[PDB]
C-alpha cells in the first residue's frame, strides 16, 4: 500500500513494484531514511569555522545568537540568499552556454548547427539595439547580439538588456527599492559576498538583494537562454506528441536525454536521423532509434521537435527500471547521481556530456559546439551497442502513451490570436477567462507524486482560470489528459468557450524551467498594453511540489515582478518570524506580490483565485 | 580569573575581559562557549534543496549512506567546501570591483576629493596589462583604459585573467592542462554555485579542481585588482613607523575606529578629520585632537599607506568599545561582528555603516559613494564629535601602552630596499642566510588562545632563518610581541639577522591586508620567473594558524593551487570525507605541486613548513 501512496500514476506504480522485487532502492526509499532539524528551519549557519552555529528557542536563553553575534533573522535570510543564488547560478550558466553556442555559429565554428530562426534573431537584435538588424548579414547581427548578451554577464551595466520589456512603473519601482538587476553573474557574486560573516547583517537588506539576484535570473540568465535557444533551434509552434513511460518502444533503441541543455540533445536527435546511423540500429535487430525526453531537456525537445517525454523528476529512476533504457545522455542540473547506480543494475549506458556535470562512474563523452556532430554520433553508437546487451526478461514498459499538445510559445499564442493580444484581453475583460496561473513546480518525495499538481490544475481551469504549464507539470498535466484541445470539457464555461474558439487546450505548455521567462514576457506585454503594472494583472504562479534552488529563484523573481506565487512546501525559513512575515506579507507592501505556503491544493486554488478576483476589481472588472 | 587568562596572551585583552565581565557584557568567547555542540562540522550535512536536508551518517543498518538525490559523502563535502571557497572569493571579488568603480569615478572626474596618488604605478600597471602608450597619454585616459581591462576580468569573454601573466609559464601551462585557468572573477563564483546545485557536478575531483579555479580567480583577479588599484588610488606603501594595541586610543581625543576592508571610505574619513572646520568642531567640544585608529583589514590598509595606528585584530574589536573611549565605529563591510552594534549601545559609541552591502540592523547608516564621499565622511566625523560630548568618563579605561611597529612593505618597497632588483634576496637564499619565506596570513579563532599560535609560529620560523611575511590579523600579533621592528633581528636566526641588519628591516615584513596576500603571489611569481622555475620550486610556504573565515580558506586554496605549501591551524569542515581530506592533504601535491597541512601545534607546524622548504632547497641544488 506504500507504493500506492508514492505516486498517482500506474506506470510509476508498476516500476516501484519492479524495483522492489529486484532490490533496487529509489528516491522514495532514501527519502524515508533522511526524514529525521536546525538546517530545515534555516537557523543553522556554517559560513565560517568560528563555529557551526544553531539558533534555538531554548528555555535557559542560550544559543540565541551566533558566535559572531548574528541573530535568527540574519542567519535565516543569509541561507535563503545563498539558496536563491544557487538557483540563479543554475539558469545563469545555461544562458551563458547558449551565448557561446550562438557565437560559435556566428564565427562559423559549430558544424551541424545553424541559425534555425533568422527572423527571431533580427527581431531580438533590433529590440536590444543592434544597428540595422533587419538588413545586415545574419552572422553579423548574431555577433552583435552575442556582445549585448555577454555584457549582461559583465559588470558595467545599470540594468539588464531585457529589463526594458517590463512596464515603466515596474522598472521605476525596482529603481526605488534597489532591486534593478545590473549583471547576471554580479548579483550572484554580491549575494555570496553579503552572506559572508560580518558583511550584510540586515534581513530586509538580504531579502531585497535576493529579489535582485532572482530578477537577474528571470530577466537575464533564463530570458537570454530562452530567446537564444529559439534563435538557434527554432521558435516553438503548437504540435502533437505523447507522454509517460509508454513512449519507450521494445523493438527500438531507446535513447533518453536528461538535463537542461538543448545544445546537446538537438544534436543527439540529428545523429539518430543520419542514414548510416539508422543502418546500425537495424543491423543490431532494432526497428528504429527512439529518442525520448526527460526533465527540462525533454521539455525543450518536446516544444521544438515534438519528441515524446518519458516522464518528470521522480520518473527518471523508474525509466531505467523498465529495462528498455539503452542509454541516458545527461548534461547538467537535476540529474540524480543515483541514476548511475541504477544503470549499473542493467545494460544501460549512462553518458555525461558536460564539463560542469561530472558523475563518478559515468561514461564521459564531452560535447562542445565544435565537435558535437562527431561526438553525438559516437554517443548514439554506444546506445546501439548497449541495446545488443539488453536482458529481455527484465523488460517491462507499463502503460500506453497519452496524447498531448505542446509548443505554446508567446509567438505561437499571439499568432493564434491573429497577431495581437486584443482577443485575449477581451476575454479577460468579458470574464470568460478570469485569470492566468503559471504552474512551474517539480516533484518532491514529501508529496504523493503529482497529486497536488493535477488537482490544482483541475481546480483552476474549473474556475475559468487558464493554466500555463512549464517544467515537471507538463508531464503531470499531460498524463491526466489536460494538454489537449478536447480537455476544454473539463474547464469552466467561459474558458472552454475560448479554448474551443482558438482550438487550444485549457493548459498551455510553455516550455522548460528557463521558459518561465516566457511567462514574464507575456505578463510584461499585457501590462504594457493596458498601461498598468504586472501587479495589476489577474495572474498567479504556483509551485505545489517544488524541491530545488532553481524553483525558489523562479518563485522569487515572480513575486518581485508582481506575480503572487504559491508554494506547496515552505522554504527553510520558518526559524525566523520576521523573515517569514516578510516573505508572506511584507513583500506585498514593497513589490505588490508575496509568497503563499499552502499544502492543500484546493485551498491554494482558493488563494490564487482570491488574488485574481481582487485584481479584477482593481481593474474595475467583474470577478 | 583563570578563564580570562586562557582566552588571550595580551594584557590589553585581559584588562577588557575583566571590564566586560564586571559590566555584564558578553563577548565573542561567551557566545562561542554556547555554540560548542556536528554534522556540518564534518561537512556531511547538505541543505542544497528541500528534498532533504540530508545527513550522511555511519549506521550498522547501512541506512543514511546517501542523500535523497543519491549523493554520497564525497560529493556533499566537496560541494560544501566549494561553496565555502566561493563565499571567500566573493568577499574579495566585490572589494576589488569597488576599487575599479572608484578609479573610474576619478577618471570621469566624478569623485571629489579623490586623485591618482601614484601616477607612476598607474602607467606601469597599465603598460603591463596592454594599455597602448601608457607612458605618455593623459593619466585619466590611461586610467580609463585600465578600468576597461579590469572590468573585462569581471566579464565572461576572456580565456585567462589579466594579471595571470605574472605567473611562470610552467605554472600557467599546468593550470591549462588541469582546467584551473581562471577566466572571470564573477564567472567562477557563479559556475561554482551552479556546480554545487543538486544534480549538476557529482564528482569530488571535478568540484575541487573548480574550487582551485575559483580561488585562483580571487588571488590573481579580485584580490590582485584590489591591491594594485588601491596603490594607484591611495599610494604605494613605503616603510614607516606606527603603533598597535588598545593604547593607541587617547583619553583626550575624539577616537574614530575604522573597521572593515575598504580603504575608499577610511581614506576619506581621515581626510575629513584634517579639515579645519572639522578640527574646530572637536576643539569646541573639549578634545585635544581627532584620533583615527584602525581595526581589521581597513586598519591594515591605513597602516600601510598612512601609518595610522592599529587598535587591534579580530577578537579585539569588541574590547576596543569596552574601553569606553571609542567614540565612533565607522564600518564598511566584511568580518564586522554584528554584536558590535549591541555593545556600542551599552556606551555612547556611534556605530556607523557606510556601504549598501554592509547593512546592520539598528546602526546609523550614512551611505558613502565616491561621488559624495567628501561630504558624507565630513558628516560622519561630525557624528563622532557629537558622540564624544556624551562620553561617560567614569567608564573609560584604556589599558596598555602602544607598541612600536614598522609597516608598509609592499613589493615596491622591498625591491627598493634591495637596490631595485631581487638579486640580493636571491643571493641570500642561495647562500643559505635566508633558508625560506613563509607568509602567515591567519585571523583569530575563539577555539584558539588569541595569537598564541601566531606569535609562537612567527618566533619559531624566524629563529630557523625563515623570513615571515605578515598580512591581516597577524600584523597585530607580530607587532604586540615586538617582532615588527628592525631591532627584532636579535630574535631571529644568525643568517636572517645578518640580512635584516644589512637592510635595516624587521625579520617579519608587514605586507598589508588580506587582499594584499596577492602581493605574496606577485613576489613568488617574480622569484620563480627570475630563476626560470615554477612557484612550486621556491622555498616558500603559507600558514593560517588561527583562521576562521571563508576568505582565509580561499586564500589558502589559491596559495596551494599556485604551488605554495599551506598550513592551517584548524581543519575545514571536510573531515567527514576521507577522499576529500586525502585530496586536500596529499592528492593535490601530485596535481598542483603543493598541499594543505592541518596542524594545531605551532611548533610542529614550524617543523612541517621547514621540511618542505628544505625539500625545495634540495631540488634547487642548494644547501639545506
Ligand atoms: S557567520 Fe556567525 S553565525 Fe555563521 S557560523 Fe560564523 S560565527 Fe556562526
Ligand atoms: S542536493 Fe541531494 S544531498 Fe543535498 S539536500 Fe538535496 S537531496 Fe539531499
Automatic annotation (TrEMBL), chain A:
Protein name according to UniProt: Carbon monoxide dehydrogenase
UniProt binding sites for [Ni-4Fe-4S] cluster: 260, 295-296, 334, 442, 472, 513, 548, 550
GO molecular-function term, one example from the UniProt record: 4 iron, 4 sulfur cluster binding
Pfam family, one: Prismane
InterPro entries (UniProt xref): CO_DH_a-bundle, CODH, HCP/CODH, Prismane-like_a/b-sand, Prismane-like_sf
Highest taxon of the lineage: Bacteria
Reactions mediated catalytically: CO + 2 oxidized [2Fe-2S]-[ferredoxin] + H2O = 2 reduced [2Fe-2S]-[ferredoxin] + CO2 + 2 H(+)
Residues that bind [2Fe-2S] cluster 1: 39
Keywords, ordered alphabetically: 2Fe-2S, 4Fe-4S, Iron, Iron-sulfur, Metal-binding, Nickel, Oxidoreductase
Record: residues binding [2Fe-2S] cluster 2: 39, 44
Gene transcribed to yield this protein: cooS
E.C. number: 1.2.7.4
Top-level EC class: oxidoreductase
GO biological process, one term: generation of precursor metabolites and energy
Residues the entry annotates as binding Fe(3+): 513
Binding site for [4Fe-4S] cluster 2: 45, 48, 53, 68
Keyword Plastid among record annotations: no
Cofactor: [4Fe-4S] cluster
Amino acid at each position: 500500500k506504500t507504493i500506492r501512496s508514492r505516486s498517482i500514476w500506474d506506470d510509476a506504480h508498476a516500476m516501484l513494484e519492479k524495483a522492489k522485487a529486484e532490490g533496487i532502492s529509489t528516491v522514495w526509499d532514501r527519502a524515508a531514511e533522511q526524514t529525521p532539524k536546525f538546517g530545515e528551519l534555516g537557523t543553522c549557519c556554517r559560513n565560517c569555522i568560528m563555529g557551526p552555529c544553531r539558533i534555538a528557542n531554548r528555555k535557559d536563553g542560550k544559543m540565541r545568537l551566533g558566535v559572531c553575534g548574528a541573530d535568527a533573522d540574519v542567519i535565516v535570510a543569509r541561507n535563503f540568499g545563498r539558496f536563491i543564488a544557487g538557483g540563479a547560478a543554475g539558469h545563469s550558466d545555461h544562458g551563458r552556454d547558449l551565448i557561446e553556442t550562438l557565437e560559435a555559429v556566428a564565427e562559423g565554428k559549430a558544424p551541424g548547427y545553424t541559425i534555425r530562426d533568422v527572423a527571431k534573431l533580427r527581431r531580438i537584435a533590433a529590440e536590444l539595439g543592434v544597428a540595422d538588424a533587419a538588413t545586415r548579414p545574419a552572422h553579423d547581427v548574431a555577433a552583435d547580439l552575442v556582445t549585448i548578451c555577454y555584457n549582461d554577464f559583465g559588470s558595467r551595466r545599470n540594468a539588464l538588456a531585457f529589463l526594458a520589456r517590463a512596464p515603466q512603473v515596474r522598472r521605476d519601482l525596482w529603481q526605488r527599492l534597489g532591486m534593478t538587476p545590473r549583471g547576471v553573474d554580479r548579483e550572484i557574486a554580491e549575494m555570496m559576498h553579503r552572506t559572508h560573516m560580518g558583511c550584510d547583517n540586515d534581513h530586509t537588506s538580504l531579502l531585497v538583494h535576493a529579489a535582485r539576484t532572482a530578477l537577474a535570473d528571470g530577466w537575464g540568465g533564463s530570458m537570454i537562454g530562452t530567446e537564444l535557444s529559439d534563435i538557434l533551434f527554432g521558435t516553438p509552434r503548437p504540435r502533437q506528441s505523447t507522454v509517460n513511460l509508454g513512449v519507450l518502444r521494445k523493438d527500438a533503441v531507446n535513447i533518453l536525454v536528461h538535463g537542461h541543455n538543448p545544445v546537446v540533445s538537438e544534436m543527439i536527435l540529428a545523429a539518430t536521423r543520419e542514414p548510416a546511423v539508422r543502418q546500425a540500429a537495424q543491423d543490431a535487430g532494432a526497428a528504429d532509434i527512439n529518442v525520448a525526453g526527460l526533465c527540462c531537456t525533454g521539455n525543450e525537445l518536446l516544444m521544438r521537435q515534438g519528441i515524446p517525454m518519458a516522464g518528470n523528476h521522480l520518473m527518471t529512476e523508474l525509466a531505467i527500471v523498465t529495462g528498455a533504457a539503452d542509454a541516458i545522455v545527461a548534461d547538467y542540473q537535476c540529474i540524480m547521481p543515483s541514476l548511475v547506480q541504477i544503470a549499473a543494475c542493467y545494460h544501460t549506458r549512462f553518458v555525461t556530456t558536460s564539463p560542469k556535470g561530472r558523475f563518478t562512474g559515468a561514461t564521459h563523452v564531452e560535447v562542445h559546439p565544435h565537435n558535437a556532430q562527431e561526438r553525438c554520433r559516437e554517443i548514439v553508437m554506444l546506445a546501439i551497442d548497449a541495446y545488443t546487451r539488453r536482458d529481455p526478461a527484465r523488460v517491462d514498459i507499463p502503460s500506453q502513451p497519452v496524447s498531448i499538445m505542446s509548443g505554446f510559445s508567446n509567438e505561437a499564442i499571439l499568432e493564434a490570436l491573429g497577431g495581437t493580444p486584443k482577443p485575449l484581453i477581451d476575454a479577460v475583460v468579458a470574464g470568460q477567462i478570469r485569470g492566468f496561473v503559471g504552474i512551474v513546480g517539480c516533484n518532491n518525495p514529501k508529496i504523493r507524486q503529482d497529486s497536488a499538481n493535477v488537482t490544482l490544475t483541475r481546480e483552476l481551469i474549473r474556475r475559468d482560470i487558464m493554466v500555463l504549464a512549464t517544467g515537471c507539470v507538463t508531464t503531470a498535466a499531460g498524463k491526466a489528459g489536460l494538454l489537449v484541445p478536447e480537455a476544454a470539457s473539463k474547464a469552466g464555461e467561459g474558458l472552454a468557450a475560448v479554448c474551443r474558439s482558438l482550438g487550444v487546450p485549457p493548459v498551455l505548455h510553455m516550455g522548460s524551467c528557463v521558459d518561465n521567462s516566457r511567462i514574464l514576457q507575456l505578463c510584461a506585454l499585457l501590462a504594457t498594453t493596458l498601461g498598468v503594472d504586472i501587479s495589476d494583472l489577474p495572474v498567479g504562479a504556483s509551485s505545489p511540489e517544488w524541491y530545488s534552488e532553481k524553483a525558489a529563484a523562479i518563485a522569487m523573481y515572480a513575486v518581485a515582478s508582481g506575480i503572487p506565487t504559491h508554494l506547496g512546501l515552505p522554504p527553510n525559513i520558518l526559524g525566523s518570524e520576521n523573515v517569514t512575515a516578510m516573505a508572506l506579507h511584507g513583500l506585498q507592501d514593497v513589490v505588490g506580490a508575496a509568497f503563499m505556503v499552502e499544502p492543500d491544493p484546493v485551498k491554494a486554488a482558493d488563494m490564487l483565485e482570491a488574488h485574481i478576483v481582487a485584481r479584477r476589481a482593481r481593474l474595475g472588472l467583474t470577478s
